Write an enzyme that holds these catalytic residues in place. Structure first.
Site, mmCIF file in Angstrom:
data_model
loop_
_atom_site.group_PDB
_atom_site.id
_atom_site.type_symbol
_atom_site.label_atom_id
_atom_site.label_comp_id
_atom_site.label_asym_id
_atom_site.label_seq_id
_atom_site.Cartn_x
_atom_site.Cartn_y
_atom_site.Cartn_z
ATOM 1 C CE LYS D 153 12.242 -13.168 -16.347
ATOM 2 N NZ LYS D 153 10.437 -13.400 -16.781
ATOM 3 C CD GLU D 179 8.739 -6.960 -14.379
ATOM 4 O OE1 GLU D 179 9.630 -6.913 -15.153
ATOM 5 O OE2 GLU D 179 7.345 -7.098 -14.482
ATOM 6 N NE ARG D 180 3.345 -9.222 -13.348
ATOM 7 C CZ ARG D 180 4.363 -9.326 -13.982
ATOM 8 N NH1 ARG D 180 5.430 -9.546 -13.052
ATOM 9 N NH2 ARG D 180 3.899 -10.169 -14.661
#
Ligand SMILES: Nc1ncnc2c1ncn2[C@@H]1O[C@H](COP(=O)(O)OP(=O)(O)OP(=O)(O)O)[C@@H](O)[C@H]1O
Ligand SMILES: Nc1ncnc2c1ncn2[C@@H]1O[C@H](COP(=O)(O)OP(=O)(O)O)[C@@H](O)[C@H]1O
Ligand SMILES: Nc1ncnc2c1ncn2[C@@H]1O[C@H](COP(=O)(O)OP(=O)(O)O)[C@@H](O)[C@H]1O
Ligand SMILES: [Mg+2]
Ligand SMILES: [Mg+2]
Ligand SMILES: [Mg+2]
Lengths: 456, 512, 177, 457
Positions: D153, D179-180
């Protein structure tokens, strides 16, 4: 001082004490009339402790006076426990008088430290071919016998007691935790008839008992084995169903006020398993070799009680209902049974190569089951047909008649050495017995008995 | 009309009859109301913070986790069974800290930093906080330096870099600890320090892991942090954060560290027990709702930070150096069910994963890596130049070969491109097998990737590939030592190294 | 939970204070006035209003009760109201009276009869009950036309049935079976 | 007047106020002396409010004084946000000093009205072959990129940001939700090196932050995109994980006193989804083109969170675990991904017959796969053999090398036009490449590159 019973819900009793005399966690208590022993679990506040009875609670009322003993549940230890049957409280139940002990030990203690751990990989030969092949044992090690209902767990343990008794000269402790009372009577009269009773100490808390007895009886048997280990000896510890300790912790868990974890278990499951299992080890003072039967609920290995039990063991023997439904005993799945002694720097390259080749042939036979079920053996390739033929001969040669299974069949039991097992499975894997039929490999000891059974 | 709260007890109420003022007890002191299952509920302690240490009599310490209206719920950092109702509890004013430093290398400690190996005291000059906030987005530098596990399938297909988080996931007893311990053992000459954290293991397994580190010469580069199975669930929950703080000492001074968490699933079981006994409301498989946050606050602390953050931290003492912390968490699944809660959370946090499967473990492929499901999010950035050039496209071609080998099982006749693809995939599958406790350097793996990918294996049949590999490495270690040393300086590749390896394999196949 | 389960530590704290400071009749009159004030409908409508704080509810109860409360009873009212336990105020008082009956070694006995019993008959039943229960007893006599003769003694959970209605029920059960 | 903290259980904090000064729902509160903000969720009665922290709860005690701001969480808006990285509260988390904004906006807002809606049908070319074939995008439309953990994605979103947002003449807002941190730093240096950062506003709340940050950071990014849309402009908006907004709403939910719904979720799941998704849309004042990647838990599309996200989008791109496990990337499942612009009046007749022919041949081969897996290839008829060979070539030709994935493949990336894609898939469907091997169509780009690769096998 004395307290009063304020609540009785099943096996769990709340006792109110005065505020300067509240008893500690794991302290034994005594009801003044009936002499029922209680063991304190929780301090709820307000002077009230929550405890679990070590016995029946029918006939007890609110308002009874309860004394505190000042210490934990203490059982007799030492030389005087040998030859004798005791319950969870250390009382004798064999109608043979009092135990003449010289000391008593409490049943709750800590695990030995990291600096006191002992390493060792010296092999223990069992005489059973599948156990010596694919999951070998060590002296001072830990054995689990996983399996569902009626697949063999007790028969295998009785054979492992009989064959491990050959080259062992020390003591033994046998703990019956939540199993059949008739099995306890048979094992006691068998040891009394064959004069090995004076080396073995017996503790029993069976399926007929209230769950405090089943919750605490394995601690008593382990306390006796810990005294024998701390005298510098090499001792054997056998526990029939360790799953039944855990299930007793299910039965009191909601009565102790706990919220349930997944599939209705107690939330303290891994900690109760760890606090029990970390005392079983060998130390630098002495060694304990332990064999434990482990029940699998509804044949599901991903149930949380066996799945927490798997990492506490050195050797794991998984039994299967499908293999026993094929008629193969001792019914060991060879692709699910592992041990840490299956390592080329422990057992040698030849035994390891034979075990890896047997597991390769059985795994590639397991991958062809649906295509053999739909289209048959005839549409395989030729090397696949040869591997299915050698795989069925390996599956038949993994079975073995047992000495304790002589009542079931009438065929005599066999003891097979490790060298004959390695040589026979190597001769099946190399192609030396491709001319033999497969039913000559069934229920024999050696490969030479398969050679004599083929000419019949 | 609710139930009785834990401050509704008649000494407390009679206290309020005698004096209504809250200053009857000091704001840094309280008294124990209730003790059950490692949970101590305390009346008082009005100035306590979340995560603050609480002093009990007898040297016992605890930590406050629930700060309710009338009561404080605390978890015991040790044995709880000696604690009693009516004991006095004190605020220390401090959060939990552990010793940090290079003095912990070679030592086996518990989750609080006390030594358990019997080798004396630890003379650490510095302590640091167990619970810490990971550095922000402006202070990081992209992962571009290699971490070598010594394995062909990991260093060629799923590469790990300095600051990356790579999961090791799979079923029981198929070699997760073997991969992580061999990745620790291969750092003994690399400069990267190591931390191994054992959560929920039995102690003999921990001592077997430490003796396997000592036999391979890697124990002096490794801190071992142990929180075993009979210890309290609070210490089992706090052990990865304490080992992470011990690894982060080396990251904050411009050096490089590597950490293994050998069971994060058992840390989730211990935190599930602490959350259920504090009566926090549960969710899927009775896990608490914050359990993803329990992993994501841990694994985001593994990072590669820039040179400016290191110069800000050391106040100009260390200049021009980056620091990194590389994580290898390990997750146990139940018969291949990756749809459970904790494996879904940990696959979703890391920079890729290594999937181990039981069927190829039983079929003789002993590192057992499923190349179709395993992946690295850093990719060729985490590799040296010769390994990046020789490993390009191996993983997706092996996944296409697993598709084609199950498609053409009963095919009568195939074309030449199909026969070439199947024969090449069978040789690369056999080339990826490797024994435990045998690391390979950069030069040996590049000899093996040159031989597989340049077509020097097409005359070698399958049962001879492993023998060909060991004999070819033994031939380059006798005849081309400066070439293997020149590859082992940095991992370089040009035309001259290409021609030297091509002439060496052509002379090996000519004469041997 | 039950009302007695919630009302137990408040009555035990008040009984331990009043036994430690020799103020048993003062707290018994204070908790009786507090229970009867909290069961009146206007005070009960005032104590359920949502815009009032707990301190104002305790201050309104203290200003209503007045001279029947000393200062530790007022401290007890503020401790009850801060923990939102004002509806427990009858039950607390009842449990206090039970604790005082165990301290002075007395038991409150209800006697119901078919016809009126004289003082000689009450002194005779009270002496028999004081010999049985080893306590000073206090009888409370009452009438019932359902009984045709005899008395029924009720002391806590102890019931002694000497009426002929119970002997009629025993004869009916003995001849029905 | 100020309140005081009475309870701290996890991320949820209860504050008592006087009865004349209770703060409203979604009012921001400032704790005195510690740098933490609280957002009011519930009014519990008796002056007590229940709130979520917008920071860590390690320095908090009971008894701390809490002030009310009298308004919601207000973030900076305007063109001062361009080129900057902000958190959920609008503070700068770069080191470039203060934001010199001229206007602040609250993050909580009504959806636009039914009369305010405006929908166009202009085609937006992407340069990815499977996306241009089976799921054509719309200008001012909404795009979902569904998929499990590791199927691509983020790489697909970076390829769409390269092929759309770099040549875009307007403004962009990127919202990193749960997220990261490594990917957030990687994207900031990628927009800084490409001289693109001056048109893009970055808003970040990572996965290690407290659940209150991850719960409101998408509202902060959407508020800045709403200011750019209501200025009359054409705005792009990229959200890398809209699922993390949902999951953080899981994490606080039963500590807020809610009984759980099915599969452990909050009972207010669809309403909290609809309140965020109904503000993203294009209006009559301006247009928003939004690309959101949606995480699918354990590749189960019948899990309730992606199944509620499916109705909100115009163009749905579903990534398969199975196709990525065969080594094929972009890994779009061509039978499970639809679009509202797959209409003969929008893209033409020829594009529609090429896409339905590809889907019919692949759906036929999906029913023939286990038959060849059991008996083999020779046991079919002739048209089945020709259709299985054309279908395997269709499944290899759906793959494409990307410019942002050259660190993973080793091979350079390709841009393929729509007409090249339609002509190549029509040439495979008509049997004009029945002589080439199936390996010639794997990772090539245009159909001419497949012909050049077939001479090298
Ligand atoms: N490359 C290899 N070659 C041969 N044997 C191997 C290899 N890797 C692992 N093994 C063996 O596999 C067995 C299981 O490995 P290991 O104990 O590391 O598994 P694990 O999944 O971590 O287990 P646990 O359930 O204890 O955590 C060991 O006996 C080990 O010797
Ligand atoms: N080795 C064996 N040979 C023959 N029958 C066996 C053997 N092991 C088990 N069985 C059969 O299975 C039954 C159940 O065995 P048991 O050990 O009692 O099972 P478990 O302990 O798993 O409940 C035996 O009574 C017998 O009928
Ligand atoms: N187009 C692609 N080409 C090559 N490898 C890819 C591609 N897309 C994904 N991958 C591989 O799969 C990994 C996971 O992709 P990513 O976008 O991070 O997944 P997600 O965001 O869905 O979790 C990448 O880091 C890379 O290793
Ligand atoms: Mg049995
Ligand atoms: Mg392990
Ligand atoms: Mg991603």
């Amino acid at each position: 001082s004395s307290g009063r019973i304020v609540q009785i819900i099943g096996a769990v009793i709340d006792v109110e004490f005065p505020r300067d005399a509240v008893p500690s966690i794991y302290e034994a208590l005594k009801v003044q009339g009936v002499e029922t022993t209680l063991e304190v679990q929780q301090q709820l506040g307000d002077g009230v402790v929550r405890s679990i009875a070590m016995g029946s609670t029918e006939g007890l009322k609110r308002g009874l006076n309860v004394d505190s003993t000042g210490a934990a549940i203490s059982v007799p230890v030492g030389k005087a426990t040998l030859g004798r049957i005791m319950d969870v409280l250390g009382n004798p139940i064999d109608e043979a008088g009092p135990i003449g002990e010289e000391e008593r030990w409490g049943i709750h203690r800590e695990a030995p430290s990291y600096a006191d751990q002992a390493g060792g990989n010296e092999l223990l030969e069992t005489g059973i071919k599948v156990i010596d092949l694919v999951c070998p044992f060590a002296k001072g090690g830990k054995v689990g016998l996983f399996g569902g209902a009626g697949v063999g767990k007790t028969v295998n343990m009785m054979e492992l007691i009989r064959n491990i008794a050959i080259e062992h000269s020390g003591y033994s402790v046998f703990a019956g935790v939540g199993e059949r009372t008739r099995e306890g009577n048979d094992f006691y009269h068998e040891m009394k008839d064959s004069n090995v009773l004076d080396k073995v100490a017996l503790v029993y808390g069976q399926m007929n008992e209230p769950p405090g007895n089943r919750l605490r009886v394995a601690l008593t048997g382990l306390t006796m084995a810990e005294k024998f280990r701390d005298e510098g000896r090499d001792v054997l510890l056998f526990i029939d169903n360790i799953y039944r300790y855990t299930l007793a912790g299910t039965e009191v868990s909601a009565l102790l006020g706990r919220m349930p974890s997944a599939v209705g278990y107690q939330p303290t499951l891994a900690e109760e398993m760890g606090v029990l299992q970390e005392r079983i080890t060998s130390t630098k003072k002495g060694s304990i070799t332990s064999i434990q039967a482990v029940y699998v609920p509804a044949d599901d290995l991903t149930d949380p009680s066996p799945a927490t039990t798997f990492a506490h063991l050195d050797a794991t023997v998984v039994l299967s209902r499908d293999i026993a439904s094929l008629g193969i005993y001792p019914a060991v799945d060879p692709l699910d049974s592992t041990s840490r002694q299956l390592d080329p720097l422990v057992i040698g390259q030849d035994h390891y190569d034979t075990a890896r080749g047997v597991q390769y042939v059985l795994q590639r036979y397991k991958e062809l089951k649906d295509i053999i079920a739909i289209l048959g053996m005839d549409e395989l390739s030729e090397a696949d047909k040869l591997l299915v033929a050698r795989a069925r001969k390996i599956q038949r040669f993994l079975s073995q008649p047992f000495f304790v299974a002589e009542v079931f069949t009438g065929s005599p039991g066999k003891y097979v050495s490790l060298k004959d097992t390695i040589a026979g499975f190597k001769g099946i894997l190399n192609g030396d017995y491709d001319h033999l039929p497969e039913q000559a490999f069934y229920m024999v000891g050696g490969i030479e008995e398969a050679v004599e059974k083929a000419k019949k | 009309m609710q139930q009785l709260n834990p401050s509704e007890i008649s000494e407390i109420i009679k206290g309020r009859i005698e004096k209504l003022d809250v200053a009857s007890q000091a704001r840094n002191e309280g008294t124990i109301v209730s003790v059950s299952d490692g949970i101590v509920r305390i009346y008082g302690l009005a100035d306590v913070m979340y995560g603050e240490m609480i002093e009990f009599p007898g040297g016992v310490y605890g930590m406050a986790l629930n700060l309710e209206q009338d009561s404080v719920g605390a978890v015991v950092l040790g044995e709880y069974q000696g604690l009693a109702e009516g004991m006095n509890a004190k605020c220390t004013g401090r959060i939990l800290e552990v010793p940090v430093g290079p003095e912990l290398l070679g030592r086996v400690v518990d989750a609080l930093g006390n030594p358990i190996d019997g080798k004396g005291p630890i003379d650490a000059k510095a302590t640091d906080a167990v619970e810490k906030v990971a550095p922000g987005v402006i202070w990081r530098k992209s992962v571009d330096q290699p971490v070598q596990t010594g394995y062909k399938s990991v260093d060629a297909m799923i590469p790990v870099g300095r600051g990356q988080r790579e999961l090791i996931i799979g079923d029981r007893q198929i070699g997760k600890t073997a991969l992580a311990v061999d990745a620790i053992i291969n750092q003994k000459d690399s400069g990267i320090k190591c931390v191994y954290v054992a959560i929920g293991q039995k102690q003999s397994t921990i001592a077997n892991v430490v003796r396997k580190l000592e036999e391979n010469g890697a124990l002096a580069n490794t801190i071992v942090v142990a929180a075993s199975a009979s210890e309290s669930a609070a210490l089992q929950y706090l052990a990865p954060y304490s080992g992470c703080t011990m690894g982060e000492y080396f990251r904050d001074r411009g050096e490089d560290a590597l950490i293994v968490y050998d069971d994060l699933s058992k840390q989730a079981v211990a935190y599930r027990q602490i959350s259920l006994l504090l009566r926090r409301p549960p969710g899927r498989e009775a896990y608490p709702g914050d359990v993803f946050y329990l992993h994501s606050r841990l694994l985001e602390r593994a990072s590669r930070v820039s040179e400016e953050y290191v110069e800000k931290f050391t106040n100009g003492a260390v200049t021009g150096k980056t620091g990194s912390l590389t994580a290898l968490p390990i997750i146990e699944t139940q018969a291949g069910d990756v749809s459970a809660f904790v494996p879904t959370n940990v696959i979703s946090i890391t920079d890729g994963q290594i999937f181990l499967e039981s069927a190829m473990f039983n079929s003789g492929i002993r590192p057992a890596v499923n190349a179709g499901i395993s992946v690295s999010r850093v990719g060729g950035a985490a590799q040296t130049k010769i390994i990046k050039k020789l490993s390009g496209g191996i993983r997706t071609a092996l996944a296409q070969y697993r598709e084609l080998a199950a498609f053409a099982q009963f095919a009568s006749d195939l074309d030449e491109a199909t026969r070439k693809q199947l024969e090449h995939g069978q040789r690369v599958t056999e080339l990826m097998k490797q024994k435990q406790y045998a690391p390979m350097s950069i030069a040996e793996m590049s000899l093996s990737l040159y031989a597989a990918e340049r077509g020097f294996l097409q005359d070698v049949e399958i049962a001879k590939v492993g023998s060909f590999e060991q004999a070819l490495i033994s031939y380059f270690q006798r005849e081309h030592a400066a070439l293997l040393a020149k590859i082992n300086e940095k991992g370089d590749f040009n035309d001259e190294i290409d021609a030297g390896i091509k002439a060496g394999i052509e002379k090996f196949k000519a004469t041997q | 939970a039950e009302l007695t389960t919630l009302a137990r530590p408040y009555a035990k704290a008040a009984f331990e204070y009043a036994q430690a400071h020799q103020q048993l009749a003062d707290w018994s009159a204070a908790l009786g006035v507090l229970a009867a004030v909290s069961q009146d409908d206007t005070v009960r409508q005032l104590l359920k209003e949502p815009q009032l704080t707990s301190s104002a509810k305790a201050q309104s109860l203290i200003d209503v009760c007045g001279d029947k409360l000393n200062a530790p009873a007022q401290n007890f009212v503020r401790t009850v109201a801060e923990n939102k336990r004002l509806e427990l105020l009858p039950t607390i008082a009842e449990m206090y009276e039970q604790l005082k009956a165990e301290q002075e070694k007395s038991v409150e006995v209800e006697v119901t009869s078919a016809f009126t019993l004289s003082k000689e008959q009450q002194d005779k039943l009270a002496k028999a009950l004081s010999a049985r229960l080893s306590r000073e007893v206090r009888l409370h006599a009452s009438e019932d036309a359902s009984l045709i003769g005899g008395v029924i003694i009720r002391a806590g959970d102890l019931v002694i049935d000497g009426s002929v209605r119970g002997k009629l029920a025993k004869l009916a059960e003995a001849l029905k079976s």
